[PDB]
Design a protein around this ligand. Sequence first.
Ligand SMILES: O=P(O)(O)O[C@H]1[C@H](OP(=O)(O)O)[C@@H](OP(=O)(O)O)[C@H](OP(=O)(O)O)[C@@H](OP(=O)(O)O)[C@@H]1OP(=O)(O)O
Ligand SMILES: Nc1ncnc2c1ncn2[C@@H]1O[C@H](COP(=O)(O)OP(=O)(O)O)[C@@H](O)[C@H]1O
Ligand SMILES: [Mg+2]
Length: 216
Amino acid sequence: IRIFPRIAGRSYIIYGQTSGIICKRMEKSDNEFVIYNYISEHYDKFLKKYVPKLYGKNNDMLLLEDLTYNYNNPNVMDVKIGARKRKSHTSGFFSIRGYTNSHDYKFDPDEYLTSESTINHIKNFMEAGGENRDKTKQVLLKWIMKLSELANDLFEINLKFDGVSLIFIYDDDCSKCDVNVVDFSRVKLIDTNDQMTISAVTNLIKILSELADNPL
Ligand SMILES: O=P(O)(O)O[C@H]1[C@H](OP(=O)(O)O)[C@@H](OP(=O)(O)O)[C@H](OP(=O)(O)O)[C@@H](OP(=O)(O)O)[C@@H]1OP(=O)(O)O
Ligand SMILES: Nc1ncnc2c1ncn2[C@@H]1O[C@H](COP(=O)(O)OP(=O)(O)O)[C@@H](O)[C@H]1O
Ligand SMILES: [Mg+2]
């Protein structure tokens, strides 16, 4: 069994026996599966735009689209935009849980950060994208484009996105990038929209916009 190079979480995640699939164990309940099916039926468009494809269930394993598959040299960042179980966010509106090569920059998932340190970590994650300034900006701008639509669409969705993350990805050559929403294990039905989760996305859009705009 080939272990999947996670960037965060404690979940058992392996490569599928097949190309472009990862197998994630549902450790505690089947809630993740219940939530994908509910979103599939009530917010189909949201699932297609923002969420890795669920190809199937196998006992307690979900077969999920590998978001890294189409990438020569993927850089991954996990940012928790949903509410934490009991702790407050390490960056106010959201918590960076890890990124490719975070070890090299002495990143610590338990450390509460200033705005300066939050921004510095996101710049650290962007460093593997090289010094072509007008190409790493294109990556930031494609992220802003999809996070913008996601925030907009979140106003119309009556779920509490407890625990969910954004997986940011970009290839070393900056030819390709994306961001998707993952990990529905703790998501709940509610009667309003999730303003906490919306503020996380808007705060990220703000930070990425300041990076896409500064001239340094
Ligand atoms: O051991 P795990 O089974 O992976 O449990 C993990 C929880 O997710 P579930 O798997 O749904 O329980 C996760 O909450 P969620 O991600 O649902 O929001 C916690 O984050 P928080 O309490 O919300 O901040 C993680 O702890 P910290 O992030 O360090 O607190 C915890 O992992 P760890 O305890 O091993 O680090
Ligand atoms: N569909 C996916 N494709 C690629 N990597 C993924 C995918 N889903 C999760 N990951 C990776 O696995 C890690 C943990 O995923 P997540 O669903 O948040 O698990 P947990 O429930 O343990 O928090 C992420 O930080 C990311 O590196
Ligand atoms: Mg998670």
